[PDB]
């Protein structure tokens, strides 16, 4: 029987630990009724993984039945993959940053558009137990100061990114829960003898509220988050980790498929892009002034 499938076919690029977990997720009944896992590229000869076989990234590019890529390797290869899978005519799920330049990214929407593909920066911080406890907590409340630092052990720059990029996940937890900011300072501490490292970013809200962005790294130091908020009703100086954030990944994903259904509002979809490359278009600034 000749039966044209209707699953899109998914091929994940970059098989270090994120590519490792979009693989695993991809076997799971949740990726069952509308994704099919076709293979994997990578820069390495691995020829297979399990069952799952190894692509050629020019095969890729060429394969009809692949219909999605799934960008997973280091941020510095992020906008290359991209813009070769896009203009190839694949959509492309990327973990974030899609890009280390405000300019590519600009570029990448405008080529997705182009070829009307859906193009996904996944934002799993978002979608923490942490920040729906965050989201509740701001709900009616007026910001007057607070400061959100996070803690970590050295990250290889030329890789992974300037710290407001690879870290810009706590910028996007700030711009979400308080809207578009306005860039006062960045500052820049570096010991690289010792791997250590310190950003300080003054930001302000349009409500005139004052927030201190700071991502630390160095030998030793645990992942750890610290949240201050200052409200003119209470004060939050702790945010509760009771779970282990089951899914999240999946949970990603899901939102990607209904992309991919044409199951999301235009003004959804607006929403979105416009916070993304806000938060960008900062780190960019930031890595200017630093």
Known sequence: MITNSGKFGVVVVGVGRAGSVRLRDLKDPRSAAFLNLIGFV????????????????????????????????????????????????????????????????????????????????????????????????????????????????????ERFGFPAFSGISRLTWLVSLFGELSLISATLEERKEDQYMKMTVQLETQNKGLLSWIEEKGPGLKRNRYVNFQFTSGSLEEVPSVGVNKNIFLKDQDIFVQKLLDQVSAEDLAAEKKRIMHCLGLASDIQKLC
């Open 42 to 157: 990578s820069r390495r000869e691995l020829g297979s993984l399990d069952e799952v076989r190894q692509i050629s990234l020019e095969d890729a590019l060429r394969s009809q039945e692949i219909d999605v890529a799934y960008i997973c390797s280091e941020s510095s290869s992020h906008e290359d993959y991209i813009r070769q899978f896009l203009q190839a005519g694949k959509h492309v799920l990327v973990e974030y940053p899609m890009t280390l330049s405000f300019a590519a990214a600009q570029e990448l929407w405008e080529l997705a558009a182009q070829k009307g593909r859906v193009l996904h920066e996944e934002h799993v911080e978002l979608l923490m137990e942490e920040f729906e406890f965050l989201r509740r907590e701001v709900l009616g409340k007026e910001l007057l100061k607070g400061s959100l630092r996070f803690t970590a052990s050295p990250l290889e720059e």
